[PDB]
Amino acid sequence: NLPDMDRRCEHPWRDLFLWAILQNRQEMANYFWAMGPEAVAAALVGCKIMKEMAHLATEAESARSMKNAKYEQFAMDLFSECYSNSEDRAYSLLV
Amino acid sequence: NLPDMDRRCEHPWRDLFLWAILQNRQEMANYFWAMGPEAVAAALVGCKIMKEMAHLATEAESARSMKNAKYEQFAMDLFSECYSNSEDRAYSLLV
DSSP states (O other): OOOOTTSOOSSHHHHHHHHHHHTTOHHHHHHHHTTOSOHHHHHHHHHHHHHHHHHHOOSHHHHHHHHTOOHHHHHHHHHHHHHHHTSSHHHHHHO | OOOOTTSOOSSHHHHHHHHHHHTTOHHHHHHHHHHOSOHHHHHHHHHHHHHHHHHHOOSHHHHHHHHTOOHHHHHHHHHHHHHHHTSSHHHHHHO
């Protein structure tokens, strides 16, 4: 079921962002998100995964960092920029 | 009952901090606390002694300085650092 081990990823930035997010590395995850093709969906997925891991976090420092992921803030800011730009392509982007 | 007058103190920084604290010298007391072996207990003892002397203070300026000893703040900050570091050695430190 696994793909070809030598075949390059179809969505490299998506996989890198997902990988960096599963391990609470936020600075790196942020850099990967800044390079991904679809940023609003990536930010929402990131915030979902962060708030999901916040419960499973053992260390208090890691849980505190996870609760302040502010990945939803990135999505809101980028969508505010998009809405200010077009306001007609923004709806198509949403839907 | 007194110890040997020429014998060096077993806990020099503790005695210096205690001495500097009994006389409302806070800057010096702070420096001694920064050098002591056990800092959380020293800070709590310092804040206890300060709030105990605050009642006995005659001058209003001395009482005002004593009520703002913020030695408990030092203990809280240092324990926050310790808890963020290990969170498992912090409990052993507490108990």
